[PDB]
Amino acid sequence: TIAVTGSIATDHLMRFPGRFSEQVSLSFLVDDLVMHRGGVAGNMAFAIGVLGGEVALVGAAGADFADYRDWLKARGVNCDHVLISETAHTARFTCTTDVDMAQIASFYPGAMSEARNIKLADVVSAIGKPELVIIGANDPEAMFLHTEECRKLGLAFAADPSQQLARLSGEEIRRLVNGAAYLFTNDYEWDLLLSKTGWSEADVMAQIDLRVTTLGPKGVDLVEPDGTTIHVGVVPETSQTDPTGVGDAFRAGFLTGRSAGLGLERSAQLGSLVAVLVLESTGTQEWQWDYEAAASRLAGAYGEHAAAEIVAVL
Amino acid sequence: TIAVTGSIATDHLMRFPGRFSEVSLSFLVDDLVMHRGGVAGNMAFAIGVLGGEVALVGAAGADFADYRDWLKARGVNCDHVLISETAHTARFTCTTDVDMAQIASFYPGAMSEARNIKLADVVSAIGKPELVIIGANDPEAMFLHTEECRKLGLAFAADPSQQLARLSGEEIRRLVNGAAYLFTNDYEWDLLLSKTGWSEADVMAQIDLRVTTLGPKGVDLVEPDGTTIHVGVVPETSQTDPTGVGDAFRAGFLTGRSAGLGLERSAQLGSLVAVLVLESTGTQEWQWDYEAAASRLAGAYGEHAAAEIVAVL
Ligand SMILES: OC[C@H]1O[C@@H](n2cnc3c(C#Cc4ccc(-c5ccccc5)cc4)ncnc32)[C@H](O)[C@@H]1O
Ligand SMILES: OC[C@H]1O[C@@H](n2cnc3c(C#Cc4ccc(-c5ccccc5)cc4)ncnc32)[C@H](O)[C@@H]1O
Ligand code: NA
Ligand code: NA
């Protein structure tokens, strides 16, 4: 049972058919505008549900969440513990993506700010202790309180600060990392974390059980404290539609695989599959799950043996 | 009777409490409001509020109901808004920083259907308007509107504004000839001269008046013979949001001209409406207070000019 904390949002996604090239008053004429369900916690919960996992969504939304709830619940997500603001609206992510998958975005937190009032003790009380708590991009204070609560209650947690790393300070990031069963970042975020925390690579590795560093088209690295390193290349894409939510999908597929008892490499291969499915669609939860297509692409990228091992648990 | 053609939209306006000075830009914003917008909507709203007879001529989606009720409640004739069967109203998405710098993206949507609007139908229904504003719109719609104005003998104001970036030289040239007014800002004026290959005198020989807004330095009104009037801004008490300030200036100026005011008095009224828009979030969220208008006009331009302006409202 995975508890997913983080932002719940509506993503307003636009497509610019050009290349961001301005060199202030930028204006981009866009040829596509879609509104989809989003937020890192929503994306990851959706993906874990679709893949058949036991998952609860733990975040702060406004009252408009009804339809979103019905969507998530239809894929097995426990939405009981979504905090609903009576006054604030759900967070909104507004993003314009160009031909090269470069993004210009703005994020309005709104109801997300109230996530600091959520107590994991209540979720535990209601559902028992989850096997993993994902501390995703959220209200910063909510992130700290969730992490501290996980440490006090003995809950294994995955640090997934993601977009909020830019906002947070060194002391803040440091307070987020110690004791994590997983640390998730991309490579640029990994460099930024090392810089801001003042930690060396070995400083971080001595405080976590596993580092997962996504590398975009170069795949993903999984590094154990002793230096054991697994590199998993991407599932090659047939199109680059929109990069929004690709990292969330990788994390969700990877942690679903781990929850199904798969090894590190097999879990990362499954995560790579879900990631490419998200890369090839517009929106973070618009991707479809086709069992046979999944088997086929997994086998093409990683071999029939790995594909069979992966699909056997889904 | 002023006919306003141009974009009808919903403006999604955000505020970045920082300074745009940071590819993967990400801005954490502390305000998000959704307001009624589009250049034609803004100008029609302003002309209605100020008591003018105005018709809105643009393309919207089906959600336009509430917007229509609003505009009509301020006296705007919305009969000739074309309503798309499938497309939603255009959306303008903008993030503004402390210095009023903007990073925006514009989705035309239903606006593209404005090319199917015939000004002849509007004329038929309401008679010949005293002025047609060719605001930022579907480019082909802009050309067809301008040509129709020339064909029917309708005086028109060239107001390409945001679309100048999209359009080409020949296109811009096609928009200008015969205009009773040419509206741009100073940067847009330079860009127009560059892209069209025209000199200043080339343009002035084809229009009756050039109006070039200069942001904080006010506005210039240049006649073909070189007669030039400069009108400073109405000084602001706050820089809230720059969206729609130019539309408000144009609307106040052309309302003044329709009320028989001179060029300078009309530009002073336009400066007032412009500052009212600058001091609020959204393009049509500003209120009209007669006494506050008189007082600020008198403070900026003298009691005489203020009395002359308010006498017609
Ligand atoms: O994974 C994609 C999902 O993320 C969801 N989302 C997209 N942004 C976010 C954020 C965030 C942020 C941020 C913080 C600070 C600055 C900043 C400001 C000023 C100066 C420097 C930095 C900028 C941006 N937080 C939570 N979820 C997000 C989206 O809803 C989408 O579905
Ligand atoms: O006056 C404010 C009102 O304008 C309304 N609006 C805000 N934009 C627009 C536009 C436009 C544009 C444009 C064209 C071309 C490029 C471009 C692309 C690629 C490369 C170079 C340039 C970008 C942007 N058109 C009509 N109304 C607008 C808003 O609804 C608001 O209320
Ligand atoms: Na996507
Ligand atoms: Na404004």
XYZ file of C-alpha atoms and ligand atoms in Angstrom, chain A residues 16 27-29, chain B residues 7 9 11 37-39 42 92 106 111 136 162-163 165-166 243-244 247 283, ligand 2:
55
model
C 3.965 26.289 -29.434
C 4.213 36.350 -26.468
C 3.771 32.897 -28.016
C 1.017 32.051 -30.487
C -10.383 39.299 -30.650
C -11.199 36.085 -25.360
C -7.774 36.345 -20.087
C -10.853 40.021 -22.516
C -9.911 40.324 -26.144
C -9.061 43.688 -27.692
C -12.098 45.543 -24.087
C -4.961 34.801 -23.428
C -2.382 33.229 -27.013
C -11.164 33.712 -33.252
C -6.068 42.353 -33.495
C -0.331 42.105 -31.290
C -0.799 40.652 -34.787
C 4.448 40.288 -35.181
C 2.613 37.561 -37.110
C -3.001 44.215 -19.849
C -5.540 46.168 -21.884
C -7.255 49.157 -25.637
C -9.078 44.680 -18.732
O -5.188 43.937 -25.332
C -5.196 42.801 -24.515
C -6.030 41.847 -25.068
O -5.357 41.130 -26.151
C -5.862 40.002 -26.237
N -4.865 39.382 -26.979
C -3.695 39.053 -26.557
N -2.998 38.610 -27.561
C -3.704 38.658 -28.662
C -3.508 38.334 -30.040
C -2.130 37.734 -30.506
C -1.124 37.297 -30.849
C 0.236 36.705 -31.315
C 0.528 36.636 -32.649
C 1.762 36.097 -33.075
C 2.682 35.639 -32.134
C 4.032 35.052 -32.597
C 4.170 33.692 -32.763
C 5.364 33.171 -33.173
C 6.458 34.027 -33.429
C 6.320 35.389 -33.264
C 5.127 35.909 -32.854
C 2.390 35.709 -30.794
C 1.161 36.245 -30.371
N -4.485 38.508 -30.860
C -5.615 39.002 -30.476
N -5.825 39.337 -29.221
C -4.899 39.168 -28.295
C -6.104 39.620 -24.691
O -7.258 38.819 -24.803
C -6.219 40.719 -24.050
O -7.463 41.077 -23.375
